[PDB]
Subunit: 172 residues, 3 copies
């Protein structure tokens, strides 16, 4: 077990190659362990990379990258999750109340087409890349039918001849 | 390498101070390797904490906190993801069918304003924060246009006179 | 410290037990430390599993599983997250631009009832016959009110001439 500090990370076919100081430990270190979480920090950024030696052989040293210590989120009690490796306020939380995500902009899909924003507590859903079709038995807004089964009542006309509720939305 | 049990965890500027028993290995075993996933367990939990010493130096020790042994989910074949640290029901799964999130409630945004729930197969989308605005070339419920371009057919009045299709929704 | 390949993973009450190919080092091995992220690979998969021993005692030794490196994602600079352990294009990214999820299908809830798709930007939201109820001070589409507070102007009767706007959508 030994301790060194990160400078440079490069990609290859079978993992990531890093140079982590501690003298010129190696220009191209043996690939790093992922275990599910990985990131690509910028060149020469504060963070530390522990190296584990295969047996006692100095020829093999797997790194264990860690989030920068200035940027570790102080999670609340009985909570956990993952976070942006360079900021403590863009994270994902799985709690006893609800699956909580925090960020100033949300996106989904292959090409980030489905974009959702919660700016100022409002809702701005943007999917301008195509059509929007919803399936649901009976739709509301504030508990009032606004979907495919609503009808608009009429009122008195110029001749005073009252009318009834109009027909539902047209079918193409 | 050595194994230990968890006693108490408190936050710190550049890590997480933890007591791990083992005859009191240290009142604050400051280092806690953070590779993306972390949590703040309650005092005196069943989970087991391993300690790793920098080289052979017994002064420096790094902890590797683990999910409690008695609360580990049994994932299905060809699946993986992160889970609620203290329960096997609230989790996230990335599979060959769909990005699956399981929980009894859903919240988003900076202050959980955008709240979504899925109870008893139903859908309850709450955005009490404020206004809701959607951008899309269409809005079709069950495949029927109810968006900004729908229009209502009209029927005969008390005078027997038939009108034409209604105008689109009023524009502010 | 040693390094080996994965052979077969079996579930058990105390955790997940995996047998590796260290000359049959153990058919019923010490479990895989579950630091949040875990997965259940198919039998005889190519991935590689390390193994550490509690102290120098060879009787007990924990292993740490790694994502197979032929399916390792090459994250962009200033980015990180978790991925599908068997594919590099099914992942979640927490960036400095937006919380990004990539997948051909999206599901939520206890039983995947709330299903969302973003195929070709053609947003398709399916609730499996559920009751979609939305709460918001004002619902809009393309910047036009189509919610619970929209009204429809109408046309001129035949011998009845003009008339006022319609009533709001019918209540239940």
């Amino acid at each position: 077990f030994e301790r060194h500090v990160f400078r440079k990370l490069d990609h290859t076919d079978t993992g990531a190659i890093v140079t982590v100081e501690g003298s010129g430990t190696m220009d191209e270190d043996v690939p790093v362990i992922n275990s599910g979480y990985g990131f690509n920090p910028e060149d020469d950024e504060e963070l530390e990379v522990f190296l584990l030696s295969d047996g006692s052989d100095a020829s093999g040293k797997f790194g264990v990258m860690t989030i920068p210590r200035n940027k570790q989120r102080k999670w609340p009690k009985k909570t956990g999750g993952i976070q942006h490796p360079f900021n403590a306020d863009k994270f994902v939380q799985l709690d006893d109340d609800s699956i909580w995500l925090k960020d100033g902009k949300f996106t989904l899909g292959d090409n980030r087409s489905l974009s959702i924003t919660v700016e100022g507590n409002n809702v701005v859903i943007d999917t301008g890349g195509g059509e929007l079709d919803i399936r649901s038995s009976k739709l509301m807004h504030n508990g009032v039918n606004i979907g495919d089964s609503h009808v608009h009542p009429q009122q008195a006309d110029s001749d005073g001849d009252t009318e009834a509720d109009t027909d539902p939305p047209k079918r193409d």
